[PDB]
Amino acid sequence: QEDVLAKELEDVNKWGLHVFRIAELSGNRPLTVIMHTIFQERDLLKTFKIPVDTLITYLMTLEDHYHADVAYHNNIHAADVVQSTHVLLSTPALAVFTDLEILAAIFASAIHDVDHPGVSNQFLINTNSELALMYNDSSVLENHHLAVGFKLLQEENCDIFQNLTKKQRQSLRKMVIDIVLATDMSKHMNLLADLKTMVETKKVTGVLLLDNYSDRIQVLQNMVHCADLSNPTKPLQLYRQWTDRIMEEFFRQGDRERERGMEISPMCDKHNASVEKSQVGFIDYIVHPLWETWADLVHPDAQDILDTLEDNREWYQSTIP
Amino acid sequence: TEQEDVLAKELEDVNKWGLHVFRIAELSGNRPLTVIMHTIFQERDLLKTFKIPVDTLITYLMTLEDHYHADVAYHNNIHAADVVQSTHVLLSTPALEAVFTDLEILAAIFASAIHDVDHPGVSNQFLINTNSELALMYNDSSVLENHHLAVGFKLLQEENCDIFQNLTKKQRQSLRKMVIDIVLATDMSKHMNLLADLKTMVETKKVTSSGVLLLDNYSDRIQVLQNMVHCADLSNPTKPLQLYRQWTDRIMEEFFRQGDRERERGMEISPMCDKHNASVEKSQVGFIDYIVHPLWETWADLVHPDAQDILDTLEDNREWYQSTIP
Numbered sequence: 001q002e003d004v005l006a007k008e009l010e011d012v013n014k015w016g017l018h019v020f021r022i023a024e025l026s027g028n029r030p031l032t033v034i035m036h037t038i039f040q041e042r043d044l045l046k047t048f049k050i051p052v053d054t055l056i057t058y059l060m061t062l063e064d065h066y067h068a069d070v071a072y073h074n075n076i077h078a079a080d081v082v083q084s085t086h087v088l089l090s091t092p093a094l095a096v097f098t099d100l101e102i103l104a105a106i107f108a109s110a111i112h113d114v115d116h117p118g119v120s121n122q123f124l125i126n127t128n129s130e131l132a133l134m135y136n137d138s139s140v141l142e143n144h145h146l147a148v149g150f151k152l153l154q155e156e157n158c159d160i161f162q163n164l165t166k167k168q169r170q171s172l173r174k175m176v177i178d179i180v181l182a183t184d185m186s187k188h189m190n191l192l193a194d195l196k197t198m199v200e201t202k203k204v205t206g207v208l209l210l211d212n213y214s215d216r217i218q219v220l221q222n223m224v225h226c227a228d229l230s231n232p233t234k235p236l237q238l239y240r241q242w243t244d245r246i247m248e249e250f251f252r253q254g255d256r257e258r259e260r261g262m263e264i265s266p267m268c269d270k271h272n273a274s275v276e277k278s279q280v281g282f283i284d285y286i287v288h289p290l291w292e293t294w295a296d297l298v299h300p301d302a303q304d305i306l307d308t309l310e311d312n313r314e315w316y317q318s319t320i321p
Numbered sequence: 322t323e324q325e326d327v328l329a330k331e332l333e334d335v336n337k338w339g340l341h342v343f344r345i346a347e348l349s350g351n352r353p354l355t356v357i358m359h360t361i362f363q364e365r366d367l368l369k370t371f372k373i374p375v376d377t378l379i380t381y382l383m384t385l386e387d388h389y390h391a392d393v394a395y396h397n398n399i400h401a402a403d404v405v406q407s408t409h410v411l412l413s414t415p416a417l418e419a420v421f422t423d424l425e426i427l428a429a430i431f432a433s434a435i436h437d438v439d440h441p442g443v444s445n446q447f448l449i450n451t452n453s454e455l456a457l458m459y460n461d462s463s464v465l466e467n468h469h470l471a472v473g474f475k476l477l478q479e480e481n482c483d484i485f486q487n488l489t490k491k492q493r494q495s496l497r498k499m500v501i502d503i504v505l506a507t508d509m510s511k512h513m514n515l516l517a518d519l520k521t522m523v524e525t526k527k528v529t530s531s532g533v534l535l536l537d538n539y540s541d542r543i544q545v546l547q548n549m550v551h552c553a554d555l556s557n558p559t560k561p562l563q564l565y566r567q568w569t570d571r572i573m574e575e576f577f578r579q580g581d582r583e584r585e586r587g588m589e590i591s592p593m594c595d596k597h598n599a600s601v602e603k604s605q606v607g608f609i610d611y612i613v614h615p616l617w618e619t620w621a622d623l624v625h626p627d628a629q630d631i632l633d634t635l636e637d638n639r640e641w642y643q644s645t646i647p
């Protein structure tokens with residue numbers, strides 16, 4: 001078990017990690033064991049004088065604040081985005097980012113969905129939720145994920161940034177905020193349009209050259225956004241499991257919408273939904289346009305992932321009679 | 322009841338720039354926001370238009386006024402009533418006659434009332450640098466302005482406080498978005514971008530057959546309402562000098578108290594907050610020259626010449642504060 005886990009973790013730098021096995025192999029603690037192994041792999045514990053214990057105590061209370069009764073936005077999803085951002089950072093076309101910029105993108109991935117109630121922003125807005133009332137209908141979940149993620153650092157022996165300098169702590173906090181706020185799906189088009197102009201003005205050596213903060217944080221934003229939408233790009237046995245979990249969450253929200261008389265938002269109707277046609281449409285309009293633009297920026301480092309994405313699009317299309 | 326008759330006489334000037342807002346606060350028993358909002362709602366027939374019960378309106382106004390801190394010198398209920406009344410006058414300008422709907426007028430006035438509720442008397446940067454719970458909650462992004470909105474909307478849920486109870490859900494949805502867009506624009510960190518957009522509108526403004534401004538899209542309509550409440554927020558140097566000087570003494574009192582809290586923490590004292598080495602007169606001249614006059618001169622161009630007397634008072638007050646320096 002512990003040494004099945006040990007050898008499972010050996011592919012942390014591989015696109016297609018067995019995150020679900022690692023989850024059950026780790027006692028439902030995949031976020032803790034993956035974040036740890038990544039910090040040791042990138043040498044972040046020593047580079048930022050992070051006490052190993054304090055890293056454990058925070059990753060556990062951070063994982064506990066992910067809801068276990070939600071099918072998709074739980075600790076397994078947080079672990080999957082963490083590992084995938086870690087792989088996209090090791091892309092040959094980019095140590096383009098500093099050690100703090102790497103730690104910010106990895107830390108933002110771990111907290112990007114903490115305390116997710118399993119419902120969308122529009123649901124929280126239309127139901128007059130306390131969260132939407134607090135955050136004025138603007139990136140309600142993403143603001144909440146950040147607030148909870150930072151507040152847990154103030155708990156007993158969980159300030160993993162205790163020995164960072166004050167200027168590093170503020171620079172990290174600013175970058176983590178800018179990244180997690182970009183995970184709002186309502187900002188996907190603007191984030192992709194700005195990614196398309198970056199590739200239209202790309203300047204490489206061919207390692208890519210970013211000089212100003214607004215260009216580097218823009219790549220980090222699209223990077224974690226790419227890993228947030230990386231399910232259709234992983235192996236099919238992983239993709240299908242994520243599809244079952246996100247549809248189970250959409251149906252649960254659709255059940256809650258119908259028992260209040262609110263409109264059944266698309267892809268949420270129990271009794272009227274085509275899971276396979278929605279996945280093909282989700283790839284053709286969102287995932288593939290984003291991943292093909294990201295492929296052109298690190299051309300040709302993302303060719304394999306774009307191939308796997310096109311493979312799964314073809315397979316899901318074949319499941320449609 | 323002679324104090325009620327003096328108050329009713331002073332409330333007759335609510336349509337006029339330079340209302341004795343400090344006297345109204347005294348005559349109404351520290352309730353300027355309630356009586357001024359009630360007077361404006363009656364003046365614009367808002368209670369009948371939106372079926373607002375009078376008891377519900379008074380109950381919410383008192384509750385909203387209660388949540389303004391009485392122990393803060395500037396960002397208190399008097400400032401809220403002042404911004405409400407000054408937005409009310411700016412809405413009645415001739416260049417904007419029949420331009421905004423009753424819902425947009427209701428949104429701008431309501432936004433003015435809640436735009437600073439529960440202000441603790443310290444800036445956004447102070448709340449960010451001190452690792453406050455508010456800055457943690459709102460991730461250092463428009464911390465105060467987001468808090469003002471959340472409190473102003475939350476108080477509507479108290480007993481007999483929903484003044485929007487008879488609006489349609491499409492009306493409440495539209496009003497809520499407009500109020501949020503307006504209050505968020507009161508963040509001074511967005512002043513340069515908001516003024517840049519206002520200058521672009523002035524350079525490309527279109528007028529109608531009647532001579533009023535043509536605003537045929539939400540982006541242009543909300544931009545005018547944003548800058549209007551923003552100008553009302555920074556309206557102190559455009560008021561008669563006896564009112565301007567009182568607002569100056571109150572904001573300097575708030576600045577000095579923040580600098581004292583900045584001193585007791587070893588922090589670097591924010592500008593214009595060190596009560597041991599500060600120049601009140603030179604700061605007001607720089608405040609007018611670099612912020613207030615560029616903003617109000619641009620707004621005056623937008624409704625030329627309806628704001629000429631307001632602009633003349635601002636330039637007169639700038640000259641006076643300048644004359645006290647040599």
Ligand SMILES: CCOc1ccc(Cc2nccc3cc(OCC)c(OCC)cc23)cc1OCC
Pocket residue numbers: 185186188228231232239242243246267278279282285286
């Ligand atoms: C227009 C369609 O856009 C969207 C539609 C739905 C969503 C919702 C959404 N959020 C996060 C992850 C998601 C993963 C999913 O599949 C995993 C295999 C998924 O599968 C829909 C068929 C939808 C997902 C987000 C969208 O992004 C833009 C708002």
Ligand SMILES: CCOc1ccc(Cc2nccc3cc(OCC)c(OCC)cc23)cc1OCC
Pocket residue numbers: 509510512513557558565568569572593604605608611612
């Ligand atoms: C870009 C935004 O700039 C600024 C934003 C805020 C402030 C500080 C500030 N905040 C709110 C209200 C203020 C009212 C005042 O007086 C009324 C008579 C005032 O008087 C100068 C001391 C400063 C004020 C100062 C700024 O500019 C300094 C260069």
Ligand SMILES: [Mg+2]
Pocket residue numbers: 112113141183
């Ligand atoms: Mg999310």
Ligand SMILES: [Mg+2]
Pocket residue numbers: 436437465507
């Ligand atoms: Mg304010």
Ligand SMILES: [Zn+2]
Pocket residue numbers: 077081112113183228
């Ligand atoms: Zn996510």
Ligand SMILES: [Zn+2]
Pocket residue numbers: 400404436437507554
């Ligand atoms: Zn104000």
